Design a protein around this ligand. Structure first.
Ligand SMILES: CO[C@@H]1O[C@H](CO)[C@@H](O)[C@@H](O[C@H]2O[C@H](CO)[C@@H](O)[C@H](O)[C@@H]2O)[C@@H]1O
Ligand SMILES: CO[C@@H]1O[C@H](CO)[C@@H](O)[C@@H](O[C@H]2O[C@H](CO)[C@@H](O)[C@H](O)[C@@H]2O)[C@@H]1O
Ligand SMILES: CO[C@@H]1O[C@H](CO)[C@@H](O)[C@H](O[C@H]2O[C@H](CO)[C@@H](O)[C@H](O)[C@@H]2O)[C@@H]1O
Ligand SMILES: CO[C@@H]1O[C@H](CO)[C@@H](O)[C@H](O[C@H]2O[C@H](CO)[C@@H](O)[C@H](O)[C@@H]2O)[C@@H]1O
Ligand SMILES: [Ca+2]
Ligand SMILES: [Ca+2]
Ligand SMILES: [Ca+2]
Ligand SMILES: [Ca+2]
Ligand SMILES: [Mn+2]
Ligand SMILES: [Mn+2]
Ligand SMILES: [Mn+2]
Ligand SMILES: [Mn+2]
Lengths: 234, 234, 234, 234
C-alpha cells in the first residue's frame, strides 16, 4: 500500500468510518480516519484557499482552509514525518465523489519544499493556470486540465454537473526530497485554491493535498470516502 | 516598555533570573525569562546557524541552532503572536556581554514574513555580507558592520578580542507588518549565522533574534543577561 | 539634483519636451526625456500590469505593460546602472496629473533586488494590499494609502474622481543596495498593477517606477509632464 | 535531432569548428558553434560560478562566469527563445572530455522559470548537495552523484584523475514550461558552481547549462568538443 500523509478537506461525513458529523478539514497519517479534524464550513460554490505547513523543527503539520468572507478552519497535528514518509515522495492533489458529488476544481496549487543544513536543497512550483497538456503533472484517474486553466480532479459533466463515483489526482512530476538525515530543517508548505460546487443535495467527497511514495497510484476502489488516497477505511 | 518577542542563544546561565543551569536556547515572550528553553552546547569559535520559524496557523514559534558537526538544539513554544506583538514591528538581532564576554558576530542574516489572505504582502531580506555602511540596518548601541563583511553586535577588538559591558543590535530598516487581524496566515522565518568566540572564564551573554515595536530601542541597562532586549528581569 | 532611473507609463504626449505623439512607455535615465519609448495603448479604467527587469549581466533595463486582453507594450534599453545610480537607492512609484488628469492607482507592487557575490544580498517585497497606515512606505506629496486597499499616487476624490496638478510617490522604507562594485550580478525587477481612469479630454500624466538616491524627494514643480521625478525637462 | 539552447563554458578551443583560440563562454543556439562568445580565463582547480539569465521582455540570453578572486567573463545574445525552443523542455547540465580532460564537478545548481501574467506558473529548484540517489535528476552517460555531495558530470578516476572520452549530463526530472503564448513575461535563470581541474596539462572540454526537448538524450559521439549537446559540429 502507498504511504499517505494528507490534509483532507472532507465535505461528506462518513460517521461509519470515524468522520465527525460535520464537514471538516483533517490531518491523515496512513489512515483516512484523520488524526485531527476541525469543523469546516464548506462554502458551496465559493473559491476556498487551503494552506498546509510543516517543518521538521516544530514538527507540526498545520492546515488552514479559508474563504474570502473570512471564515477559516484550522487543524494541526504534531507528527514526525521522518518516521512516516519515505525520504523521497511525490506530492499531489486528490479528490473523489461517491454516491454524492461535487466539482473538485483546483484553480491554483503551489508547493515549496526545503532541506536546509548549515547556511539548502529546495523545490518550488506554482500553478496558477493549468494547461491542457500540463507536462509537469502526473494526472491520475479522472483528473483533467485546461483550457479554462483549471484542474478538474473529478468528473464534471458537459452541462456542468459533477459526477458521482469519480476520483482523480494530480501529482507533481518530479520526485520531492521531503526529508534528509543531514538536514537541520526540512520544511514544506502547500497552498491550493479550489472551487467545490454541489448543485444536487450534498457535496461529497472532498479534496486532499497529499504526500506519498513516488510510485503512488489511486488505490482501486478509492472513490468516495477514501478520497483517492486509501485502499480501505482502516 | 518595548514589546519583545525573541529567540535567545543564551550563552550564560543566570540561574538567579530563571535561566536553566547551562547554555540554552530559549523562546522569550515579553520577558527575558524564557517560556521554553533547550540545553545548548555552544561551540566556541565555531560558526553556528539559527533558524527561527513562526507558523501563524500552527501558532508555534520554533528555533533550532546547529553547528556543522550536526549537534543541534531545538525549542518550540505554542503561542499566538497576534496576542503579543503589535501589528507593525522591527525585526533584528541583539547581543550583549556583561562581566563575562564573547564575540557576537553575525556572518549572515535572512528574514521572511508573509501576510496572506486569499489567492499576500511579504518581505524578505538576506544579508550574506555586511558593508561598513549597511544602510538598510539600524545599528543600535555597540553594533557595527564591515569591513570583514560581518555584523559585530557587541564591541570586539581590532584583533578579534571581545569586550565586556557591551550591547548592540541591528534592526532591519523597514517596518514589518508581522500580523494583521484579517491575515489567514501570518508567517515568518529568520535565519542567522553567528560566530561566538570567547577565551573567558565563561562566554556571555548571548545573541537574540527579536521582534519589537518599531520605535524599539535598547532599554537602559540591558547589557549582560538582559541581552539588549529587556529593561529588567521580570 | 536627485539621480533618477525610471520606467514611465506616460499617458500624455508632451511633444515639446521630446515625448512621441502618443501614450508610451519609456525608459528614463537621469532625464524625463526617455532614452527609449514604445507606443502604449493605455486602456482607460482597465487594470494594467507593468513588469520591470534589469540585469547587470545583460546590462539591459526592460519594461512590459500589459492589460488582460493581451495588448502589451515593450521597451528595453541597453544601460549599465553601475554607471548611473548610486550604490544605495530607494525604489518607488511616482505619478502626476497636470492641466489634465487621471487616477494613478496602484493595486499591487513588488520588487526584488539581488546582489551576488563573488554570496547574495537580496531584498524582496510584495504589496498586494495597501493599508491606511502603510508603515513600510514613504508617501510623498499626494500619495495616499487605502482602502480601497490601494495606493493612490495622486489625489482622487473618495468618489473616484482624479484631481489636476497632483503629484505623489511611494518609496519603500528601506534603502536598497542596488549595485556594488564587487557584485557579479546586480539585478532587480519590479512589477506593479495599476488603474488609470480619466473622463478628461486627455489623460495625464502617467505613473513611473523609479529608483532614486536614498534622500530623494519630489522636486519642486514636477507635477504634470515631469512625473514627480525630475526638476526640469532637460 | 534534439533542439539545444546552451550556455557553454568551453575550456578547449576547437578552432577547426569555429571556437576562438582561447577558452571562452559561449551562447549556443542549435549549434555547438556559439552565436556569441567571450574570452574566459578558466581558473584551474578553483570554484567558478556561472549565472544564466533570460527573459522574454528583453529577449537577451546572458551569462556570466566568475571566480571568487573577481575575474568574470560575460556573454549575451539577443535571441527569441519562443522560436527556438519547444514550449516544454528539460533543463540540464552537460559536460564532456575528449582527448584532453578535466573534472567537470558541479557543486550546486539552481534554476527558476516563471511565466507571468496575463498570473504565474513557476518552477524553482535549488541543489546545494547532490545525493547518491538523486531522484529528481535524470543522469545521463557518465554523470554521477557522490557523495561528497557533488555532481561529477564526467568520469573521474579513483586516483582523482579525470578521464578522456567522457560525457555526462544531469537533467531536472520535471519538464519545464519555458514559454507559453498567453504569458506576458517568460523568464528563466540558472546558476551553477563548478570545479574544473585538469591534472593532465590541458583542460577539455567544458561544461554547459542547456535547455532541450523533454526526451533529450546524449547524442552518440558527443564526447569531446560537442559537450554532450550536439550530434555534430555543424
Ligand atoms: C562573576 O559572575 C557574575 O556575578 C556577579 C556578582 O553577582 C554579577 O555582577 C554577574 O553579572 C554580570 O555578568 C553576567 C555575565 O556577563 C551578566 O549576565 C549580568 O547581567 C552582569 O552584567 C555574574 O553573574
Ligand atoms: C491644454 O493642454 C496643455 O497645454 C497648456 C498650454 O501651455 C500647458 O499648460 C500643458 O501642460 C500642463 O498639463 C500637462 C498634462 O497634464 C502636463 O504635461 C504639463 O506639465 C502641464 O502641467 C498642456 O500641454
Ligand atoms: C446516502 O448516504 C449514503 O448511504 C449509502 C448506502 O449505504 C452509501 O453507499 C453512501 O456512501 C457512498 O457515498 C458517500 C458520499 O459520496 C461516499 O463517502 C462513500 O464512499 C460511498 O460512495 C453514503 O454512506
Ligand atoms: C592534440 O589536439 C587534438 O588533435 C587531435 C587529432 O586527432 C584531436 O583528436 C583532438 O580532439 C579530441 O580532443 C579534443 C579535446 O578534448 C576534443 O575537443 C575533440 O572532440 C576530440 O576528442 C584535438 O583536436
Ligand atoms: Ca468523509
Ligand atoms: Ca543568560
Ligand atoms: Ca508626458
Ligand atoms: Ca571547444
Ligand atoms: Mn474525514
Ligand atoms: Mn536565558
Ligand atoms: Mn514620456
Ligand atoms: Mn566553444
Amino acid at each position: 500500500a502507498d504511504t499517505i500523509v494528507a490534509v483532507e478537506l472532507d465535505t461528506y461525513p462518513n460517521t461509519d468510518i470515524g468522520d465527525p458529523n460535520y464537514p471538516h478539514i483533517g490531518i491523515d497519517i496512513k489512515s483516512v480516519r484523520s488524526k485531527k479534524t476541525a469543523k469546516w464550513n464548506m462554502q458551496n460554490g465559493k473559491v476556498g484557499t487551503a494552506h498546509i505547513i510543516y517543518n521538521s523543527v516544530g514538527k507540526r503539520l498545520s492546515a488552514v482552509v479559508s474563504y474570502p468572507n473570512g471564515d477559516s478552519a484550522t487543524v494541526s497535528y504534531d507528527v514526525d514525518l521522518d518516521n512516516v514518509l519515505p525520504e523521497w515522495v511525490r506530492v499531489g492533489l486528490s479528490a473523489s465523489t461517491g454516491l454524492y458529488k461535487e466539482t473538485n476544481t483546483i484553480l491554483s496549487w503551489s508547493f515549496t519544499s526545503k532541506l536546509k543544513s548549515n547556511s539548502t536543497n529546495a523545490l518550488h512550483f506554482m500553478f496558477n493556470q493549468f494547461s491542457k497538456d500540463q507536462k509537469d503533472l502526473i494526472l491520475q484517474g479522472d483528473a483533467t486540465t485546461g483550457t479554462d486553466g483549471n484542474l478538474e480532479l473529478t468528473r464534471v459533466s458537459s452541462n456542468g454537473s459533477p459526477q458521482g463515483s469519480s476520483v482523480g489526482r494530480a501529482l507533481f512530476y518530479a520526485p520531492v526530497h521531503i526529508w534528509e538525515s543531514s538536514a537541520v530543517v526540512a520544511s514544506f508548505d502547500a497552498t491550493f485554491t479550489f472551487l467545490i460546487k454541489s448543485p444536487d443535495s450534498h457535496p461529497a467527497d472532498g479534496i486532499a493535498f497529499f504526500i506519498s511514495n513516488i510510485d503512488s497510484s489511486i488505490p482501486s476502489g478509492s472513490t468516495g470516502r477514501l478520497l483517492g488516497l486509501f485502499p480501505d477505511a482502516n
